[PDB]
Design a protein around this motif. Sequence first.
Motif, PDB file in Angstrom:
ATOM      1  N   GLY A 198       0.806  -1.217   0.000  1.00 60.45           N
ATOM      2  CA  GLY A 198       0.000   0.000   0.000  1.00 60.45           C
ATOM      3  C   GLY A 198       0.838   1.265   0.000  1.00 60.45           C
ATOM      4  N   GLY A 199       0.392   2.248   0.780  1.00 70.11           N
ATOM      5  CA  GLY A 199       1.124   3.502   0.952  1.00 70.11           C
ATOM      6  C   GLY A 199       0.571   4.662   0.150  1.00 70.11           C
ATOM      7  N   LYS A 200       0.111   4.373  -1.064  1.00 71.55           N
ATOM      8  CA  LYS A 200      -0.438   5.400  -1.948  1.00 71.55           C
ATOM      9  C   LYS A 200      -1.960   5.320  -2.013  1.00 71.55           C
ATOM     10  CE  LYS A 200       1.465   4.291  -6.158  1.00 71.55           C
ATOM     11  NZ  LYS A 200       2.365   3.112  -6.282  1.00 71.55           N
ATOM     12  N   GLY A 201      -2.584   6.336  -2.602  1.00 74.86           N
ATOM     13  CA  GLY A 201      -4.022   6.310  -2.849  1.00 74.86           C
ATOM     14  C   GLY A 201      -4.318   5.409  -4.031  1.00 74.86           C
ATOM     15  N   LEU A 202      -5.572   4.979  -4.153  1.00 71.27           N
ATOM     16  CA  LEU A 202      -5.958   4.072  -5.234  1.00 71.27           C
ATOM     17  C   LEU A 202      -6.101   4.750  -6.600  1.00 71.27           C
ATOM     18  CD1 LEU A 202      -8.338   1.282  -3.923  1.00 71.27           C
ATOM     19  CD2 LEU A 202      -6.117   1.007  -5.031  1.00 71.27           C
ATOM     20  N   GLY A 203      -7.072   5.656  -6.717  1.00 73.91           N
ATOM     21  CA  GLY A 203      -7.304   6.370  -7.966  1.00 73.91           C
ATOM     22  C   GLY A 203      -8.086   7.659  -7.823  1.00 73.91           C
ATOM     23  N   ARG A 204      -8.296   8.325  -8.956  1.00 77.17           N
ATOM     24  CA  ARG A 204      -9.045   9.575  -9.032  1.00 77.17           C
ATOM     25  C   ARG A 204     -10.507   9.366  -8.642  1.00 77.17           C
ATOM     26  NH1 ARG A 204      -6.862  11.713 -13.579  1.00 77.17           N
ATOM     27  NH2 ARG A 204      -7.728   9.860 -14.597  1.00 77.17           N
ATOM     28  N   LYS A 205     -11.107  10.408  -8.060  1.00 78.32           N
ATOM     29  CA  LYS A 205     -12.482  10.389  -7.518  1.00 78.32           C
ATOM     30  C   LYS A 205     -12.621   9.535  -6.262  1.00 78.32           C
ATOM     31  CE  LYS A 205     -16.118  12.109 -10.531  1.00 78.32           C
ATOM     32  NZ  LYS A 205     -17.578  11.899 -10.779  1.00 78.32           N
ATOM     33  N   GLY A 206     -13.299  10.095  -5.265  1.00 75.95           N
ATOM     34  CA  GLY A 206     -13.437   9.456  -3.960  1.00 75.95           C
ATOM     35  C   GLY A 206     -12.216   9.704  -3.096  1.00 75.95           C
ATOM     36  N   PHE A 207     -12.121   8.980  -1.986  1.00 69.94           N
ATOM     37  CA  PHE A 207     -10.980   9.108  -1.087  1.00 69.94           C
ATOM     38  C   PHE A 207     -10.523   7.724  -0.636  1.00 69.94           C
ATOM     39  CE2 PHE A 207     -14.137  12.530  -0.324  1.00 69.94           C
ATOM     40  CZ  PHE A 207     -13.475  13.592  -0.927  1.00 69.94           C
ATOM     41  N   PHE A 208     -10.060   6.928  -1.594  1.00 72.39           N
ATOM     42  CA  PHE A 208      -9.613   5.563  -1.330  1.00 72.39           C
ATOM     43  C   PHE A 208      -8.104   5.486  -1.104  1.00 72.39           C
ATOM     44  CE2 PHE A 208     -13.519   3.197  -2.205  1.00 72.39           C
ATOM     45  CZ  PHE A 208     -14.258   4.104  -2.955  1.00 72.39           C
ATOM     46  N   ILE A 209      -7.725   4.836  -0.005  1.00 76.97           N
ATOM     47  CA  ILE A 209      -6.329   4.521   0.288  1.00 76.97           C
ATOM     48  C   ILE A 209      -6.169   3.008   0.311  1.00 76.97           C
ATOM     49  CG2 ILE A 209      -4.525   4.540   2.071  1.00 76.97           C
ATOM     50  CD1 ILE A 209      -5.937   7.387   2.800  1.00 76.97           C
ATOM     51  N   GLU A 210      -5.243   2.500  -0.502  1.00 75.90           N
ATOM     52  CA  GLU A 210      -4.960   1.067  -0.530  1.00 75.90           C
ATOM     53  C   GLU A 210      -4.341   0.612   0.804  1.00 75.90           C
ATOM     54  OE1 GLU A 210      -2.554   0.427  -4.111  1.00 75.90           O
ATOM     55  OE2 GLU A 210      -0.721   0.982  -3.060  1.00 75.90           O
ATOM     56  N   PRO A 211      -4.768  -0.570   1.312  1.00 78.26           N
ATOM     57  CA  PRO A 211      -4.358  -1.121   2.609  1.00 78.26           C
ATOM     58  C   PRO A 211      -2.850  -1.082   2.820  1.00 78.26           C
ATOM     59  CG  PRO A 211      -6.020  -2.511   1.652  1.00 78.26           C
ATOM     60  CD  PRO A 211      -5.699  -1.478   0.616  1.00 78.26           C
ATOM     61  N   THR A 212      -2.436  -0.645   4.005  1.00 77.50           N
ATOM     62  CA  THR A 212      -1.030  -0.386   4.282  1.00 77.50           C
ATOM     63  C   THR A 212      -0.555  -1.092   5.550  1.00 77.50           C
ATOM     64  OG1 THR A 212      -1.321   1.785   3.237  1.00 77.50           O
ATOM     65  CG2 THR A 212       0.731   1.414   4.435  1.00 77.50           C
ATOM     66  N   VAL A 213       0.550  -1.823   5.418  1.00 74.76           N
ATOM     67  CA  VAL A 213       1.178  -2.520   6.536  1.00 74.76           C
ATOM     68  C   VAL A 213       2.593  -1.988   6.733  1.00 74.76           C
ATOM     69  CG1 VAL A 213       1.991  -4.750   7.436  1.00 74.76           C
ATOM     70  CG2 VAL A 213      -0.170  -4.642   6.188  1.00 74.76           C
ATOM     71  N   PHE A 214       2.883  -1.541   7.952  1.00 76.85           N
ATOM     72  CA  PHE A 214       4.227  -1.112   8.319  1.00 76.85           C
ATOM     73  C   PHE A 214       4.884  -2.116   9.251  1.00 76.85           C
ATOM     74  CE2 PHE A 214       3.142   3.287   6.932  1.00 76.85           C
ATOM     75  CZ  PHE A 214       4.282   3.524   6.164  1.00 76.85           C
ATOM     76  N   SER A 215       6.109  -2.498   8.908  1.00 76.50           N
ATOM     77  CA  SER A 215       6.890  -3.446   9.689  1.00 76.50           C
ATOM     78  C   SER A 215       8.026  -2.716  10.406  1.00 76.50           C
ATOM     79  CB  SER A 215       7.445  -4.534   8.768  1.00 76.50           C
ATOM     80  OG  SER A 215       8.115  -5.541   9.501  1.00 76.50           O
ATOM     81  N   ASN A 216       8.654  -3.392  11.370  1.00 81.07           N
ATOM     82  CA  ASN A 216       9.817  -2.864  12.101  1.00 81.07           C
ATOM     83  C   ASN A 216       9.588  -1.482  12.725  1.00 81.07           C
ATOM     84  OD1 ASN A 216      10.861  -5.198  10.699  1.00 81.07           O
ATOM     85  ND2 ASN A 216      12.939  -4.367  10.911  1.00 81.07           N
ATOM     86  N   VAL A 217       8.388  -1.268  13.260  1.00 80.26           N
ATOM     87  CA  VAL A 217       8.007   0.020  13.840  1.00 80.26           C
ATOM     88  C   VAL A 217       8.470   0.127  15.292  1.00 80.26           C
ATOM     89  CG1 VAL A 217       6.044   1.502  14.498  1.00 80.26           C
ATOM     90  CG2 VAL A 217       6.046   0.345  12.283  1.00 80.26           C
ATOM     91  N   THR A 218       9.074   1.263  15.640  1.00 81.67           N
ATOM     92  CA  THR A 218       9.509   1.527  17.012  1.00 81.67           C
ATOM     93  C   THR A 218       8.635   2.583  17.695  1.00 81.67           C
ATOM     94  OG1 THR A 218      11.222   3.047  16.197  1.00 81.67           O
ATOM     95  CG2 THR A 218      11.899   0.783  16.699  1.00 81.67           C
TER      96      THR A 218
END
Lengths: 474, 472, 472, 474
Positions: free
Chosen positions: B363-383
């Motif tokens: 993930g990390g980025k938005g999906l596409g134009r129109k609406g407010f969709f964000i593609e699912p995002t997983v962060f690893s090694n977080v402190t």
Amino acid sequence: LPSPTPNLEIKYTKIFINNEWQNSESGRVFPVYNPATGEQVCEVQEADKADIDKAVQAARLAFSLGSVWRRMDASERGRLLDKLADLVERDRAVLATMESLNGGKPFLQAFYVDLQGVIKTFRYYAGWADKIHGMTIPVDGDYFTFTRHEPIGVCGQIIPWNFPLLMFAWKIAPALCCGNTVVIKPAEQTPLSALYMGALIKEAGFPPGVINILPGYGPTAGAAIASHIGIDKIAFTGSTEVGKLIQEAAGRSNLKRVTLELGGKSPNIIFADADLDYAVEQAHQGVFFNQGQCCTAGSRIFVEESIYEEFVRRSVERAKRRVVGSPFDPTTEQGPQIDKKQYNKILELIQSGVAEGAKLECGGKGLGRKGFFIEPTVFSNVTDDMRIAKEEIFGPVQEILRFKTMDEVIERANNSDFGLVAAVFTNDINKALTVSSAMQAGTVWINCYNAGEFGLREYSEVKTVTVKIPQKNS
Amino acid sequence: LPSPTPNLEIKYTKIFINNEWQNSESGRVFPVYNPATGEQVCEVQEADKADIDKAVQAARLAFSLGSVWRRMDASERGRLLDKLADLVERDRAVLATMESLNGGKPFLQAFYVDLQGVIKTFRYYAGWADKIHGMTIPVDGDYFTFTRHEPIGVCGQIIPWNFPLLMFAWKIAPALCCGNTVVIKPAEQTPLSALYMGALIKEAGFPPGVINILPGYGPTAGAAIASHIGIDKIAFTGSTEVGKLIQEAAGRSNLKRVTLELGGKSPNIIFADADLDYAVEQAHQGVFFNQGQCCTAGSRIFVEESIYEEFVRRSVERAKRRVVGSPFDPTTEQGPQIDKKQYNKILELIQSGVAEGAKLECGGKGLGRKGFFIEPTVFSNVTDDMRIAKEEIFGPVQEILRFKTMDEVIERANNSDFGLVAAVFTNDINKALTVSSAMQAGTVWINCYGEFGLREYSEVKTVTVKIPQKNS
Amino acid sequence: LPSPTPNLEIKYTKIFINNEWQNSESGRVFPVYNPATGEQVCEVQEADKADIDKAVQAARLAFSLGSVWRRMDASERGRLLDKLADLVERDRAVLATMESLNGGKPFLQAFYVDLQGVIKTFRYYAGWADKIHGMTIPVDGDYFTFTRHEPIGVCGQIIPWNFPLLMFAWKIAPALCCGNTVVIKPAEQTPLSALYMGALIKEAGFPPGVINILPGYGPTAGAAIASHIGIDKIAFTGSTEVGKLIQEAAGRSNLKRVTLELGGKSPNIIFADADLDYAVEQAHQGVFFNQGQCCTAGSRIFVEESIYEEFVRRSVERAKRRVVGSPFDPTTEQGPQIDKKQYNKILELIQSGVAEGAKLECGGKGLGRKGFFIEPTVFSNVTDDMRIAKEEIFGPVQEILRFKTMDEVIERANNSDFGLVAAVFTNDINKALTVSSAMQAGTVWINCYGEFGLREYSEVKTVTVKIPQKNS
Amino acid sequence: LPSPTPNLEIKYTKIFINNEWQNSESGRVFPVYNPATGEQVCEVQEADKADIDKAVQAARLAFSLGSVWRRMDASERGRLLDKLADLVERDRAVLATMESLNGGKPFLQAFYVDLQGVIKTFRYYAGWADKIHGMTIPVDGDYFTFTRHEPIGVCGQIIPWNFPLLMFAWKIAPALCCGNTVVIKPAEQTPLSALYMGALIKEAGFPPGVINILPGYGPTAGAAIASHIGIDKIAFTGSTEVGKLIQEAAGRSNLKRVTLELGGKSPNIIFADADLDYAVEQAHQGVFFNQGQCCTAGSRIFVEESIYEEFVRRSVERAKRRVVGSPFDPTTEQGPQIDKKQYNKILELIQSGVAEGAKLECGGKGLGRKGFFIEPTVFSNVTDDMRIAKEEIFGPVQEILRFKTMDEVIERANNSDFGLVAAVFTNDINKALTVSSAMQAGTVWINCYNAGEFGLREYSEVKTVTVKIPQKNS
């Protein structure tokens, strides 16, 4: 480092009615024996129907609608309970000596467990006295309704020889907390500890007639309480076939409120995942505690197939190392049994299981002359249909049974008539919750074994008063 | 097999005061957007100080001593609530549609989850109405003292856009249960599902002026409530910064009772002994549910070193297959975020986590134009010290943190300011009990993700009577 | 026939932090005034922001997860409360003498009223310690939820000079009963009674840091408690214009829970059918008790037109026979006022009513030099719109007002802003029940003058566990 | 302006078990009479030991750990109760009519009084279903103890003919709210209203075997319940000597929990300061309500000497105008008595009172041939020792006594055996609060007479579960 008081005198042998020490009406006197040696310690006045009638009159009067005990602020009823605890604490040394001498239980256990409990509960119910609340209910229409928790009245109380003082404490404390007057009847073998309490009750400043202690036999003094027309409520605790005669005698007399604390089996369930060091020791002290003779505990033990071999080995090594002897001796873990009637009733059931299938791992016979000592007994390979499995033994005998699945123990442990206590040993959440929830038991212990707000609900009665109001608003 | 109502009409767009539909005093009208396309759904009347003034007067009258709502039986107050649940039950199709169309939440989830919770709540509190009991205290001396539990008065309420209809229910039900009168302010972006409840409230036969619904903005409509001198009680729920401004403006007016329901991070703790297939799935549902934007949720997931490698590897595969698209489309798990303001605020926080060391797994980025969709995002090694760890992200972004000992996680998960909800996954009794007892949180969930509710909506009135003689 | 302890010397004049007697960080020491003679009794350490910080850290440590105060069985927290009551009972003569010398209240009232209450509450809350129960809820689905009643944490407490030791007792007892650690701030003028309790606290066997006492002024030590980031809760009692600054300081700090116990009028209502002998005496003691300055009581009294004539006659004779003088003198009924600030503020409002319409029946002026003594005062023919009727007088002055109908008093007595205590005198059931119910008050007394208290000193914690299969 | 349903169809006459209508095992059928005319209404299937046995098995199955009724959410138990109330509301016309036709109760009273009570109770306990809370206790040591409130099991319920449908609701509703299963036995003279409820139980979608309704006689069906070895709890309400046989036969079988609800006198106390117009009306509707045959009502009335003359003179005018006749007729205030056995028993007690000194003001004789109508009766100058004062008349006979002081009535009214309900009429607070507090009663009404949480305490059993924890903190 406390030790029993030498040359213990039994100073209080008379019947306690209306704050006065009175003799028996018939003039008869019964004996009290030391179960550790068999020797007669002293003699106690024998109460009968005539004695009960005097005690009910005293309790009824102490309860009338202008009484010292009724005019008393609820907060002070707790205060007299709190001061009672002070006296039990002051005389902690001598009360445990009586309980060790008369009851048979080891002295250190009587000091650190029994009396600790006795003191604890009195202070507990001292706290409750001025906190028993009713409620206001927003019922329909132009009305306003509220409820008062009020004392029942004269309460008959009959206890056994198991924990003479703890049973006394667990019955006296709730009753007085709620403003009742008590007519109590301690066991025919163990009235001494209850009798000494009479002196502390007078000393603590309890109004005359509030608590009447009547020592004597069951079918005589106890059956007189059950069939008494002037008693509002009976609270019995003991054996089942005696309990059946209590509610029967109540229904034909004056339909008094009946509460029974009868016996019944108490299965320990031990899974493979539990730690063996803690599971063996807690189950060992959960059968043999107070010589084995307690309704709160249970001899029945279900062990998983995987750890069944190791469990027996651990158990037999605790029985070959358990010190059994004098109750005054600080080294002794086990004392003697209560009666000749009791001593013989256990051996009968031991020698039943020997010729019935189970393996005699250790003990079996009596220890020797004087007292009613039985050497620690452990049975292996016990099944459900055996006499030792249905009728529970009331002594130093533990049964070790084999089980496979979780569904197996649930149906095998539940197979019991009215009265159950459960004990599970697991480190698995889902297993513990399933087992504790499916148990048809009043109380379920998880990873422990040793024996409230609902306790005083049976000692007070609801009174709902409703008033017509000019106009109702929320 | 339920489905949304096609060609939906937003019939109710006006202000709801005193069981009448009134236009805004200014006349001004504000827009409501479909977060899936950006399209304008409709136009709603905009409430302000003037509009709030009329609403309070309606509630103050409905609360007067002679009133129908006060004279009414307690059991009848629950009767009306029960009828309200009935009407929602009947209109479960259209309400879920409005919640989906207006709020972004996929239709099936709003039907089977959100509205189930709506219907159940009204049903629950309908039962409480005539069961709010006081007590009779045995106080020393010749006295007899008893307590009545009585309604406070006019209750001002302000809810967020998280669960528009649920937040509406959770607020209306207890307040009406105790016999108060309401002035409620639904978030500016999502007023629609609340305004339909206006109709059903009248239809159920609630006395006029008991529930007053006012759609509008924060500093106009909401702040007018918090400062209003004729409002007895306020119950706010939303961001912490706005919450601080509620209590301050309340104290400088009449000292009205304040109940804040702010955000706050929520740690999920996953030990090695717990079942992976279940743990991964419920923790995944613990972050991503309702597009990630919920005060009840928790983005930070601690995982024991042992299973850490497997957990991340499982957590990516559930995010790579997570169907994101149209809320009306029955296959989609994730709808769009609520705002452009929210959509940007999320993206900003992700690029913070990227340029700070955390491993962007997917993930990390938005999906596409129109609406407010964000593609699912997983962060690893977080402190713990990272920007993404401290401020909780209010979107479809999950953090997976490494932990060693039990003593470690407890301290680390405790390290939050005021808002805490917990979640442990274990098969060990001693581990689960010792964690749940040590966790400084409001609610603690074990292997998953009431009465005390109505205590804030009633006030104790203790009355003591002098009696001729006291007997026990 | 108990007497005051003759040569009572103040032994404990230092700040009590972490069970130790520490000096002020600034080094400054404030004087304590005997209101009976105007003399300086002694000098006490003036706490400030730096003193607060140390006390907070000390209370925080005694509350941490490993603490002795947290491992302690709840029943043993009851044991320490009950033991504290013993020590107050043992030093009943000493503590009553301090409360009389420092407070100004007559010694016999301090021994039999003030301290009896002090002991009784410590006995009452000792009982509650191991009886604070949560609950188990049969929620939907395969789950099992239960609630825990837990301590809040560090509790800031600020009390007035009204009932220095009672106020101390009423605030300390519940907090500890629930397992909290307390930082309390006794009034600048009456800190002595509070500090002696410090000696009884250590003697009783309370763990170090559990109770921390800090003597000093308001804007200094008081505000520092209110604006402290490490304090989880504040409980204030006193004037309304200081309580407004408490909530505000809390909202701009850490949003700690705020409990205010502010002032407000307290109307007595006396009907014609009431017993004149009993009603005159109880309403007289319902104003003049503790020199008049008590928030629990009220000066305004409504008397029915029928008995209005006789009431004034009976009222003036109880003021002309009321002995006023030295607090140590067993014959004296009334002591002096607390301050020069107080003394002047009362006279200001007396001569206000003289020129405003009310008839001066008796009193009006002071008694003379040394001490702040005011002779008992009665005002007849008082209306609602007078300055004395709205702003309540906190001294030995009672107003006697006229009322015709039943609907009159209820509207006239209700007309008040936040804070009321009612008192009715009637032998008519329908009259009493309709007056007490319609009265917008927190407490109503009928023919005279707990459990809900300890709820504000604990916080709910709901724990919900997933189960294999649910059965009823 | 509601009306009774003309040409009423009694469709439900069979035994109700497992949501199936079953004929009686013996095959026998007993008659049900219209008490207004004496004419036979219909014929109902006659239950006995055999019939009960099946019902218990159905109830036990519906209660097993796997069952729908067990797996059901607490709130969903509340849902079913609320739907039942919905259906009663729809059928209010016929359920009232069935009550009026079968019980003799005047239709408009049965519609507005009785059925309002039936509906309001199902609605009320529906609300309780998911709000039965346990506790968490901070017990000493490193332990965590919580309590569950769990259903008892199969509950046996026996009701009288007083309020055939209210009594039904009053037993069903709480028991179902707690999750129990029911075997219920309506009175032999009025089973119709309860049988009709069978259909509405199935329609609401109650799981099979949750409510088993069995119409029949006492010694057969009723006694089969109290003796059954598979019924966990019994709740009886009716006459005292039948209740005495209930608690006894329960203690001889399985020691099942017994809740009795027996009759008993209920003194009305009217002081001089009370408003005559209201007091005479409410005390009249106190005695004469539902044909005078209700345990909730109270026949004996104490009136202060000052107003004694007026009160009689007022009460005699209220009885002379009291329209008695057909229950379907809208004008009628009073219906017929239920039985020939009851009709005879009342008349006997009247001529007992006549021959004993009391003044027959009005009434005494029956009304006519057909049905069991007794004309409103007022007795004057009654004393405590009289036969009519000790035994309460279960019909339309009021008794007016005179008293001097407050102390007198408190002693005189308290003088009763077990059951007591008080009603005071005063405008004096000190008089009302003294009497209401001192009165040895369960419920006390002030200035009224009329038709909660403590209701469901008898239908669930506490289960304490204590867990051993690693370390305890506050």
